[PDB]
Design a binder for this molecule. Structure first.
Ligand SMILES: NC(=O)C1=CN([C@@H]2O[C@H](COP(=O)(O)OP(=O)(O)OC[C@H]3O[C@@H](n4cnc5c(N)ncnc54)[C@H](OP(=O)(O)O)[C@@H]3O)[C@@H](O)[C@H]2O)C=CC1
Ligand code: SF4
Ligand code: SF4
Lengths: 207, 205, 61, 325, 76, 112, 115, 109, 178, 103
């Protein structure tokens, strides 16, 4: 049809909408929203209390064998009341399909670890805790994973400075690698590349 | 293959080392050769094809014992299947352009940039501010050589990505190293590390 | 030898308005199937995956 | 805005001086004669363009002028504990300091900082100390506002003091003159001395004065060596030995073509007792709080122990007895 | 031997350095009198455990505010 | 009798039909304890009844697998066990109840 | 004498090599260099801790087999005897006894390493 | 809502247990890692770090602090954290800046 | 479609000949001798190693090497202080300050590239509208000091003058693909 | 020599790529994906390109897609060479490494 536009199919969209209604009506106690994007990606937004029940169902149920935990992520949206949005991306090999499950958490409102459901989360949850500060209940071994051993802070938070507060160098006087406040020969340049004109009228938030 | 496949020393040093069952692989989140050497029939190139992979013929190797030896055979066979795909690519290469003819997304040819006002403006803006991506979120996965390489990308409508989580196939594999090393010696652990196929650039990000 | 590379589909001198071939402007927000702000037969996320076929090129290695 | 030329950087105290200058952020010029390999440890002590290494020779005065060309401060740490075949104590502690001072005066350096020794006296039994007194006089003659620093014994990781004493284990027993008694030592910490020099590079009141950098406590040589051997859990077998025999042993050890383990002058200075402050300013004038030997002896002496005693706490050793003379 | 218990307790309370030896007494509240803090009293309890070779749970330990209380507890 | 399943760690069952009937019957029996309007009860009963009817109709194992569309009969047995355990867990979770709590005002608004 | 001389010369050559190796190079000593090695991170425990042996049974079997070699080594002189029948019977019996011991350990799983 | 402790008293019990654990571990840490400090200095540092958070009043924040302190305690118990990582608690490379207005005026702004 | 890399073939193929062949394989080390034969075959082949200093590997016209700033044939410098190079540099290695030259021309007064910060990607030379900044074919510009790897405008211009013939040839060969 | 427990410690090559990418444009962030998995560079950047194309709702031309598949397969051969012949090297077989790194 149009060479430079992605070809879209409605069969997948209709199947995903049907399954979204299916899951929503099977778990009314936890499901707070359901949506299928124009990319055809079913997305179920749940209450944080329903994480373990939802994942156990989506893994064990015959009509939803989402047995592979492809991803466990957190997105930081500072404005909203609950800063962190926890995203589980799951794959069902029996039905050759993918689903996404979302919940929310705050710096002081932990989430239930799903290591019982999926063991793949054992390290993804550790990474989320290390980089965002989201705590997880009933985790076998929750601790830092990616950051330095004595590192203080949660880098992936948007309020964290890009270059942090500390840096390392070797100090001959003490014969060690010492941590000191960061000083840069040239500071990071934050180019303002935002135009005044809106590019997409379809995403115009009402005034 | 003449050097390694049938060598009794290699067979003793790899066979039955780090055996992983299909269910444990799925539940630990293994992908690619780690799944396929344990009997699971999965391969994104076949099941969720991307680009023109649906236009080429190849066979997905499958293991039976789920050990280091089966995974090594799987990789050696995947190399041959990649040759098989490469032949078809070399023979079917179509003629045409190479980047989407949409100067609001891909930069225009320099010859046009040096002649046309619209192309010059679009080149300037593409290499200064970049193209804006409409708001949304996607998860895209491919059968990368090490497994399923994924990207969960969140765009806030601007020209800079809001979030970009990288699903490195080795991150889930290295987590199962403790499981696979049970009942094995230090030399066996060394053998196990190679089969997982780990580059730490993707693991650490 | 020197190359002479071709042109893309949208190098027409006419009937080539960008509003027709614009891709980014056709993206629409996700469809809200169910929201808390506002007998049927059991279904699956997609038809069950077909079983694979043993290769004819060389089934056993 | 300080540009400082350190003339003895490639040494025990020069490295600390350069390190502290680099931390202060002042440009540093290191004139060296050693091999390029010997300055790699200084190489990383400063950010880009902060440190400038240039080759020099004491004989060639053009090199000295080049080194002191664009410098506001000139620190002179030149020295040596033995008389080289080409350079002796007179040259090392008088001729070279005088030449450096005169070149600095001619160039127009604002500050000149010369390091001598606490017991530097014209009547000292030690050749090195007697030469150091003359060097002080000549430096203050050719650069009348030159600051003079007179450290006591300096102890650190790369020192020739605590290491020197702990190395007596290779000779079974420790020979001492008068069995250590009748000899008072006041060792100072190398970091404290370096901080003092760097601070004097800018302290407005320091110009033209003479300082005496001495540690907080004074020990009898016997108790100090006993403490050293207690820290390096070794068997301390002290015994007396008259100074003439000690000087003969030093003469023997000073015949090596390389770096002598000990020397006549070295034993003389080991056994000459340190003086008292006596109205000289001291470190606290420049703002350095002297660090006691008890805190920093472990980091110097832990490498002289055997496996059995390698992981022993600082508090497992009885502190020495400090005199009040 | 309650007298021996009370002597060991006083020995440890005097070997502790934050307190004031002369003002230290068998009747001197750690918080109200001597001036000790919560953490200080925790260290005091740990020192008593060291001396008596005996453990103490936190629930029981939070109340041992005075040496007489300590010795009464050691009576156990 | 199958010499092997294709999957490592999954043994071949010699009584596939009997085992499948056992597990499906157990799932139906446990679902009998769910509230009548539980959508999970309704849908799981549908699925289990369909699969049990297929098992009853088909004696041959290969054609039974073809009908079941679940890979190997051993995989179908595994999925039946998983469904039974999930039903047991759901009977305590009680997810049919009304939404536990609504989100804040704009918790799912994107782009923000 | 011709053997003591050569052995002493070898010992002296090795000792001279050691002396040169230690007293020729320029040496710079500090604790960071002289510390033990472990892939760049400090060891978490001493190397003198017990280090379990999973082939202890095979070691104590090797002792007995070494004594069996001791018993078998005089065979070159033994075969020079006029009682060749007795010597053969004894050699065969000894070797078969050794084989039976090895086979019994093998079957009882003594040659397998402990886990 | 409670992360662990219902109230500040339970949170304080957890904090005091953590202080006991760190106080107990300091000697073993010094001995094993061959630090050039004294047990007195190590325990003083533990107290200083505990008191640096004495202003907190929220039980949830106290629970987070205790969890992260327990993590550091595990990291130190095990020798995952090396001597270079532990000696950073002492900041023996920092030259303190003054709080005097005139001193600040002289140096910088 | 799939294939079995290692699938059991049979567990009952018993004849004397097969048993004896397997015994000979085990006791005579047949595959080990085969591997030895492969290595022996490799010994007698011409080694692929090249005499590097006097014999270098191939390089395409697109090879991204040390940066350089070019001049027009008339000796004028192409750089016109666009700062597209600076804006696009992903690693922020470029730093430019420009002033209106005495001619009234738009020219740069300083143009510094931190070659220890550059990822050698070519975005600068593909975003430069006048082919001013290029990556020549030089891959041998290691130094003994860090500061030597902070290139300034004079260094870049000297590199351009030095490699002008080769840079021009590479651009001539490759520009039609651009 | 039996392994009773394994504790992998990573993060010794965590440079903060995900946070850095937030400060770049999509084109400026493309090269990070070459460096992610430094043995399958083109596969990584192809994954990133497919994600960005999905969000942009554009389709790369057929010749571009065929080139991408061809080089994805070349990259897979490269990566499998590295994997097989470094597994062999760690086991103790050295010569496959030298034979295959020519290719
Ligand atoms: N216990 C102590 O360490 C005490 C030291 N001092 C004084 O502090 C100063 C520093 O001595 P320290 O550095 O501690 O011990 P060093 O012996 O290490 O000082 C030697 C310095 O002098 C340089 N030097 C020696 N001879 C020559 C020469 N002929 N020409 C040029 N440079 C030369 C050396 O350079 P290279 O080594 O590269 O030749 C080195 O930089 C000396 O004056 C010393 O007396 C004061 C009190 C006690
Ligand atoms: S390098 Fe190129 S784009 Fe940048 S200022 Fe110079 S001419 Fe313009
Ligand atoms: S090659 Fe890339 S990283 Fe290097 S200076 Fe040019 S744009 Fe910057």
């Amino acid at each position: 049809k149009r060479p430079t536009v992605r070809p879209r199919s409605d069969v997948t969209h209709k199947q995903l909408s049907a399954f979204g209604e299916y899951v929503a009506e099977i778990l009314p106690k936890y499901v707070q929203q359901v949506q299928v994007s124009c990319l055809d990606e079913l997305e179920i937004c749940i209450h944080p209390d329903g994480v373990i029940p939802t994942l156990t169902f989506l893994r064990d149920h015959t009509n939803a064998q989402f047995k592979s935990l492809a991803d466990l992520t957190a997105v930081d949206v500072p404005t909203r009341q609950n800063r962190f949005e926890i995203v589980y991306n799951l794959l069902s090999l029996r039905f050759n399909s993918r689903i996404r499950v979302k919940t929310y958490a705050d710096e002081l409102t932990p989430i239930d670890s799903i290591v019982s459901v999926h063991i793949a989360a054992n390290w993804y949850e550790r990474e989320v805790w290390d980089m965002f500060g989201v705590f997880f209940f009933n985790h076998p071994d929750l601790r830092r994973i990616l950051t330095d051993y004595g590192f203080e802070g949660h880098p992936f938070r948007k309020d964290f400075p890009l270059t942090g507060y500390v840096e390392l160098r070797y100090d001959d006087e003490v014969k060690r690698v010492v941590a000191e406040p960061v000083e840069l020969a040239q500071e990071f340049r934050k180019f303002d590349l935002n135009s005044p004109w809106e590019a997409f009228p379809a995403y115009r938030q009402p005034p | 293959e003449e050097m390694l496949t049938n060598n009794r020393i290699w067979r003793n040093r790899t066979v039955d080392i780090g055996v992983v069952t299909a269910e444990d692989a799925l539940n630990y989140g293994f992908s690619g050769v780690m799944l396929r050497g344990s009997g699971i029939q999965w391969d994104l190139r076949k099941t969720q094809p991307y680009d023109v992979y649906d236009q080429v013929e190849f066979d997905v190797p499958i293991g039976s014992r789920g050990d280091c030896y089966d995974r090594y055979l799987c990789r050696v066979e995947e190399m041959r299947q990649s040759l098989r795909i490469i032949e078809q690519c070399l023979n079917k290469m179509p003629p045409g352009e190479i980047k989407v003819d949409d100067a609001k997304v891909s930069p225009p040819k320099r010859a046009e940039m040096k002649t046309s006002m619209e192309s010059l403006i679009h080149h300037f803006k593409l290499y200064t501010e970049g193209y804006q991506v409409p708001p949304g979120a996607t998860y895209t996965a491919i059968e990368a050589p090490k497994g399923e390489f994924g990207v969960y990308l969140v765009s806030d409508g601007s020209s800079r990505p809001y979030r970009c989580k990288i699903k490195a196939p080795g991150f889930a594999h290295l987590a199962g190293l403790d499981k696979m090393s049970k009942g094995h010696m230090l030399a066996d652990v060394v053998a196990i590390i190679g089969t997982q196929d780990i580059v730490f650039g993707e693991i650490d990000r | 030898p020197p190359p002479k590379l071709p042109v893309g589909p949208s190098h027409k001198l006419s009937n080539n308005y960008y509003c027709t071939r614009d891709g980014r402007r056709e993206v629409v927000p996700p469809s809200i199937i169910m929201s808390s702000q506002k007998e049927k037969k059991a279904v699956t996320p997609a038809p069950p995956m077909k079983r694979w076929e043993l290769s004819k090129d060389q089934p056993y290695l | 805005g300080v540009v400082a030329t350190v003339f003895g950087a490639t040494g025990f105290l020069g490295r600390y001086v350069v390190n502290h200058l680099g931390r202060m952020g002042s440009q540093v010029i290191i004139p060296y004669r050693c091999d390029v390999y010997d300055i790699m440890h200084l190489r990383l002590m400063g950010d880009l363009g902060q440190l400038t290494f240039l080759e020099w020779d004491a004989r060639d005065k053009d090199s000295i002028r080049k080194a002191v060309q664009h410098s506001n401060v000139v620190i002179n740490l030149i020295g040596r504990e033995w008389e080289t075949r080409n350079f002796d104590f007179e040259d090392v502690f008088v001729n070279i300091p005088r030449a450096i001072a005169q070149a600095s005066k001619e160039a127009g350096v604002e500050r000149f900082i010369h390091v001598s020794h606490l017991n530097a006296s014209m009547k000292s039994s030690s050749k090195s100390l007697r030469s150091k007194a003359v060097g002080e006089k000549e430096v203050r003659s050719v650069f009348p506002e030159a600051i003079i620093i007179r450290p006591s014994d300096i102890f650190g990781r790369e020192d020739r003091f605590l290491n020197h004493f702990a190395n007596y284990r290779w000779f079974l027993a420790v020979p001492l003159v008068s069995l250590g008694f009748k000899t008072v030592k006041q060792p100072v910490y190398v970091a404290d001395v370096s901080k003092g020099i760097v601070n004097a590079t800018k302290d407005p009141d320091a110009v033209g004065k003479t300082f005496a950098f001495t540690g907080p406590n004074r020990y009898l040589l016997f108790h100090l060596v006993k403490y050293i051997f207690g820290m390096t859990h070794r068997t301390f077998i002290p015994y007396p030995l008259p100074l003439f025999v000690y000087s003969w042993i030093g003469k023997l050890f000073g015949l090596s073509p390389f770096e002598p383990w000990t020397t006549k002058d070295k034993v003389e200075r080991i056994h000459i007792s340190d003086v008292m402050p006596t109205d000289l300013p001291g470190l606290e004038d420049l703002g350095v709080q002297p660090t006691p030997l008890e805190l920093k002896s472990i980091e110097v002496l832990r490498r002289h122990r055997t496996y059995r005693w390698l992981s022993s706490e600082i508090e497992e050793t009885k502190p020495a007895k400090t005199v009040n003379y | 031997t309650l007298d021996g218990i009370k002597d060991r307790v006083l020995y440890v309370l005097k070997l502790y350095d934050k307190i004031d030896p002369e003002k230290l007494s068998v009747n001197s509240h750690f918080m109200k009198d001597l001036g000790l803090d919560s953490l200080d009293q925790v260290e005091i309890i740990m020192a008593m455990e060291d001396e008596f070779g005996f453990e103490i749970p936190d629930i029981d330990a939070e109340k041992l505010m005075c040496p007489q209380e300590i010795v009464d507890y050691i009576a156990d | 009798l199958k010499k092997t399943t294709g999957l490592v760690g999954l043994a071949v069952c010699d009584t596939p039909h009997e085992r499948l009937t056992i597990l499906y019957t157990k799932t139906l029996d446990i679902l009998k304890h769910f509230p009548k309007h539980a959508a999970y009860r309704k849908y799981t009963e549908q699925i289990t009844n369909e699969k049990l009817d297929m098992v009853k109709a088909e004696p041959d194992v290969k054609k039974l697998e073809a009908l079941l569309q679940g890979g190997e009969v051993e995989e179908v047995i595994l999925q039946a066990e998983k469904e039974l355990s999930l039903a047991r867990k759901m009977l305590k979770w009680k997810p049919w109840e009304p939404l536990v709590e609504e989100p804040p005002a704009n918790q799912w608004k994107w782009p923000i | 004498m011709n053997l003591y001389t050569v052995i002493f010369i070898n010992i002296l050559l090795s000792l001279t090599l050691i002396l040169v190796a230690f007293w020729l190079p320029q040496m710079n000593l500090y604790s960071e260099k002289a510390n033990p090695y472990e892939c760049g991170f400090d060891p978490t425990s001493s190397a003198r801790l017990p280090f379990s042996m999973k082939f202890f049974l095979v070691a104590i079997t090797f002792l007995l087999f070494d004594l069996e070699i001791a018993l078998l080594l005089p065979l070159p002189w033994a075969i020079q005897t006029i009682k060749t029948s007795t010597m053969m019977i004894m050699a065969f019996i000894l070797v078969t006894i050794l084989s039976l011991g090895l086979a019994y350990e093998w079957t009882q799983k003594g040659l397998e390493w402990t886990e | 809502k409670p992360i662990f402790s219902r109230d500040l008293n339970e949170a304080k019990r957890r904090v005091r247990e953590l202080y006991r654990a760190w106080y107990r571990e300091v000697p073993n840490t010094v001995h094993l890692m061959q630090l050039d400090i004294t047990v007195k200095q190590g325990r003083d540092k533990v107290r200083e770090m505990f008191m640096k958070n004495a202003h907190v009043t929220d039980p949830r924040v106290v629970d987070l602090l205790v969890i992260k302190g327990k993590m550091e305690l595990q990291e130190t118990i095990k020798v995952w954290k090396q001597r270079t990582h532990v000696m950073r608690f002492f900041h023996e490379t920092e030259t303190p800046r003054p709080k005097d207005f005139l001193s600040k005026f002289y140096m910088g702004h | 479609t799939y294939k079995y890399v290692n699938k059991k073939e049979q567990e009952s193929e018993v004849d004397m000949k097969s048993a004896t062949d397997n015994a000979a394989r085990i006791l005579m080390w047949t595959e080990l001798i085969r591997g030895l034969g492969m290595t022996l075959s490799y010994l007698f082949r011409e080694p692929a190693t090249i005499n590097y200093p006097f014999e270098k590997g191939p390089l395409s016209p697109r090879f991204r090497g040390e940066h350089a700033l070019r001049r027009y044939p008339s000796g004028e410098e192409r750089c016109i202080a666009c700062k597209l190079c600076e804006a696009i540099c992903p690693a922020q290695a470029i730093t430019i300050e420009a002033e209106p030259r005495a001619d009234g021309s738009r020219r740069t007064t300083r143009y510094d590239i931190d070659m220890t910060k550059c990822i050698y990607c070519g975005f600068c030379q593909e975003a430069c509208p006048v082919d001013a900044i290029v990556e020549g074919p030089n891959f041998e510009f290691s130094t003994e000091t860090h500061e030597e790897l902070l290139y300034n405008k004079e260094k870049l211009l000297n590199n351009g003058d030095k490699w002008e013939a080769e840079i021009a040839a590479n651009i001539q060969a490759d520009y039609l693909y651009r | 020599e039996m392994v009773r427990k394994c504790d992998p410690h990573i993060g010794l090559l965590h440079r903060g790529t995900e946070k850095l990418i937030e400060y770049k444009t999509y084109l400026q962030a493309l090269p990070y994906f070459d460096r992610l998995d430094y043995v399958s560079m083109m596969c990584n950047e192809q994954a990133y390109s497919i994600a960005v194309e999905k969000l942009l709702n554009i389709q790369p031309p057929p010749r571009a897609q065929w080139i991408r598949v061809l080089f994805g397969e070349i990259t897979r051969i490269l990566n499998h060479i590295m994997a097989v012949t470094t597994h062999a090297l760690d086991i103790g077989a050295m010569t496959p490494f030298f034979w295959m790194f020519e290719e």
